[PDB]
Design a protein around this motif. Structure first.
Motif, PDB file in Angstrom:
ATOM      1  N   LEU A 148     -55.486  12.202 -70.348  1.00  0.00           N
ATOM      2  CA  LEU A 148     -56.919  12.546 -70.150  1.00  0.00           C
ATOM      3  C   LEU A 148     -57.112  14.034 -70.449  1.00  0.00           C
TER       4      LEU A 148
ATOM      5  N   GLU B 250     -58.605   8.387 -80.186  1.00  0.00           N
ATOM      6  CA  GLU B 250     -58.135   8.883 -78.866  1.00  0.00           C
ATOM      7  C   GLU B 250     -59.054   8.403 -77.737  1.00  0.00           C
TER       8      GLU B 250
ATOM      9  N   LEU C  71     -58.618   5.834 -74.619  1.00  0.00           N
ATOM     10  CA  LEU C  71     -58.886   6.317 -73.238  1.00  0.00           C
ATOM     11  C   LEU C  71     -59.947   5.415 -72.602  1.00  0.00           C
TER      12      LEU C  71
END
Lengths: 29, 469, 121, 74
Positions: free
Chosen positions: D9, D41, D45
């Motif tokens: 994160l 990305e 996530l």
């Protein structure tokens, strides 16, 4: 998360720094 | 690597921040395109909540230089000259263009900005007030007449879109929408109709071919143009135009602007001008060899930093065999002058009567350019011992050229002379010695070329057919 | 190997006329005055075959006349064997080539070469 | 894997902030690359956020089960 970040992107395009700070607070959350 | 260098830049920002960057942007402001592209890139979902948006739209106008008046939150109008449009002079608001509405509803403010730019360019006319309103009226009459002429061809023959583009009166015509002006598609090359066997349908792309735009533009000289539709009475086959005067001597002429300048030969200028007196280039500019201009148009379609430095020795690689083509500019024509031509971007025609003739000459010149153009390539064929079957193109008469190659089976030079007499009817004759092996049948080569595309390609078929026999 | 292949390689990689002369020497150890090998015939065939004459092989022939590689007799015979005559450009090129050596036409060799110049005239 | 989740994160947050700085500097294909690499990305996530949602279901009950057993055993 990213949907809130997408709302943040709309605010950044409209204007912004406050929205980036809100994204940092979201990372704390 | 550079993704870790982007992580290094983020580390540098942390040492410095995003808030600091925003403050720097604000300081720069106190002192368009990319955003919309990367916006579609983001668009998994679109902006639903939209507080201001009016403020950005005011900014888009400010940058354009337009003037914005807003009645209520819903309606805002950008007004200049007759270019007034509202997102909710001398004419009603024409249409709720889906094109403009779709872009605004979706997150594409950049596309809306391009559309305004097109509208501003169309109305960049020098004439103002009453003179401009009449001049726009003349463009409207020309558009109506051209549209009717296209409709007549469809009524006479129910041709498919491809036939209309390649061999039809006028051409596939899309009526002007917003800023975009009428586009008439003069020619669709066989190689480019195929992408990576496209079937056109009525969904033909705006740029999937060669396209020319019809528009009114101010000129130093004064000309008489129709101010009302001139096809009041239409003969059922072809068209009949009622004679002028209505008309007025506005200081402008109708134009047929081409988006990319087309190299055209001196002979074409004479053949075209026979029909139309209006001087095409008026002040005689420069006029060098045509084959050089054809190479520049073909090479510059895809731009690369290194100039090819061809020396008129283009190298072509094909599925079977390798070929090298020398374009042979400077070969003397029968007159004793090498084929010489100058790029033409704008062709001016008073009425559409001479337009069918002018287009037929242009289609022939464009077709010849495409067949010779197919060869021009960025090939670094260096030290090629195997294969390398090289053939060359000497201009021998305006509208004719000869590709010369060694006989595939025997040893004498054999030359195919191709004349672009028609856009789809190049006529080719093989010249072979009295004692030689029958290289090919002119019809088989034609069938392969029509089903596929280009001329570097035609030489392959001639070699393969001879070898198979 | 053949003269046609050497001239055609000279057309393929763009060779200037003196580099053509050097590489033509190198491809053939026996010069044979270049007229036994018929230089003028091969150069005229592969210059006059793609309708409008290619200026490269004409530059090769004009160098091979102005420099004395090729005798005037072989050139005049190879000019005589062209005809066709439907193309004015190839004919004008042949008349410029004749405009080079005519008004001079001086053989300096055996008398059989002079008789050959007579028949060639 | 909590430390790895936190780090993943954090990488997204710092790189997004630097991209905003690059956008301010810009006003081409380098920003296009930055956008499509960010796409991958934050989409992975978003899949980690879907896993965080199921962590607030199954893994939360599992954690509650361990805590309840401790007190009950005592």
């Amino acid at each position: 998360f990213l949907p809130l970040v997408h709302n943040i992107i709309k605010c950044m395009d409209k204007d912004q720094d406050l929205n980036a700070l809100k994204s940092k607070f979201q990372e704390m959350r | 690597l550079s993704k870790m260098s982007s992580l290094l830049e983020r580390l540098h920002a942390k040492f410095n921040p995003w808030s600091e960057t925003i403050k720097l942007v604000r300081q720069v402001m106190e002192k368009q395109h990319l955003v919309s592209c990367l916006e579609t890139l983001q668009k998994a979902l679109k902006v639903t909540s939209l507080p201001a948006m009016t403020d950005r739209l005011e900014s888009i106008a400010r940058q354009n230089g337009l003037g914005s008046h807003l009645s209520a939150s819903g309606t805002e109008c950008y007004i200049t000259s007759d270019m007034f449009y509202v997102e909710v002079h001398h004419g009603e608001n024409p249409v709720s263009c889906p094109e403009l509405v779709q872009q605004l509803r979706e997150k594409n403010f950049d596309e809306f900005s391009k559309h305004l730019k097109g509208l501003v360019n169309l109305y960049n006319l020098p004439g103002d007030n009453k003179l401009k309103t009449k001049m726009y009226l003349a463009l409207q009459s020309l558009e109506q007449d051209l549209s009717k002429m296209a409709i007549m061809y469809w009524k006479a023959t129910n041709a498919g879109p491809l036939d209309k583009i390649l061999h039809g009166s006028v051409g596939y015509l899309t009526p002007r929408s917003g800023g975009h002006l009428m586009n008439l598609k003069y020619y669709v090359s066989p190689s480019d109709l195929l992408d990576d066997i496209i079937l056109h349908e009525n969904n033909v792309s705006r740029s999937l071919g060669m396209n020319a735009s019809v528009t009114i533009e101010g000129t130093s000289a004064v000309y008489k143009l129709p101010i009302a539709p001139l096809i009041m009475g239409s003969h059922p086959v072809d068209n009949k135009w009622t004679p002028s005067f209505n008309s007025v001597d506005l200081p402008a002429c109708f134009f047929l602007k081409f988006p990319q300048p087309i190299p055209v030969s001196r002979a074409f200028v004479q053949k075209l001008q026979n029909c139309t007196g209006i001087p095409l280039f008026e002040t005689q500019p420069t006029y060098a060899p045509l084959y050089e201009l054809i190479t520049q148009f073909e090479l510059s379609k895809d731009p690369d930093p290194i100039p090819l430095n061809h020396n008129m020795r283009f190298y072509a690689a094909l599925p079977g065999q390798q070929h090298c083509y020398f374009l042979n500019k400077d070969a003397p024509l029968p007159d004793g002058r090498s084929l010489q031509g100058t790029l033409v971007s704008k062709i001016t025609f008073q009425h559409p009567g001479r337009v069918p003739l002018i287009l037929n000459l242009i289609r022939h010149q464009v077709a010849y350019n495409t067949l010779i153009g197919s060869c021009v390539k960025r090939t670094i064929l260096k030290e090629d011992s195997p294969g390398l079957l090289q053939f060359e193109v000497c201009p021998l008469s305006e509208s004719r050229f000869s590709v010369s190659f060694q006989h595939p089976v025997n040893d004498s030079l054999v030359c195919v002379v191709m004349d672009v007499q028609d856009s789809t009817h190049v006529s080719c004759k093989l010249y072979k010695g009295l004692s030689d092996a029958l290289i090919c049948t002119d019809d088989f080569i034609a069938k392969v070329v029509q089903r596929c595309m280009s001329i570097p390609v035609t030489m392959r078929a001639i070699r393969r057919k001879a070898e198979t026999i | 190997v053949n003269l046609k292949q050497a001239i055609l390689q000279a057309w393929k990689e763009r060779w200037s006329d003196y580099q053509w002369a050097i590489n033509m020497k190198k491809f053939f150890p026996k010069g044979a005055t270049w007229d036994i090998l018929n230089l003028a015939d091969a150069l005229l065939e592969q210059a006059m075959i793609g309708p409008s004459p290619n200026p490269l092989i004409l530059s090769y022939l004009k160098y091979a006349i102005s420099s004395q590689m090729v005798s005037y007799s072989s050139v005049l015979t190879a000019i005589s064997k062209f005809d066709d005559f439907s193309r004015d450009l190839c004919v004008q090129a042949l008349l410029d080539i004749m405009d080079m050596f005519c008004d001079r036409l001086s053989c300096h060799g055996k008398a059989e070469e002079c008789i050959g110049l007579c028949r060639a005239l | 894997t909590r430390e790895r989740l936190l780090s993943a994160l954090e990488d997204l947050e710092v790189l997004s902030r630097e991209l905003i700085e690059m956008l301010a500097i810009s006003r081409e294909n380098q920003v296009l690359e930055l956008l499509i690499h960010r796409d991958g990305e934050f989409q992975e996530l978003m899949k980690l956020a879907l896993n965080q949602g199921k962590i607030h279901h199954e893994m939360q009950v599992l954690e509650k089960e361990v805590e309840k057993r401790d007190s009950d055993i005592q």
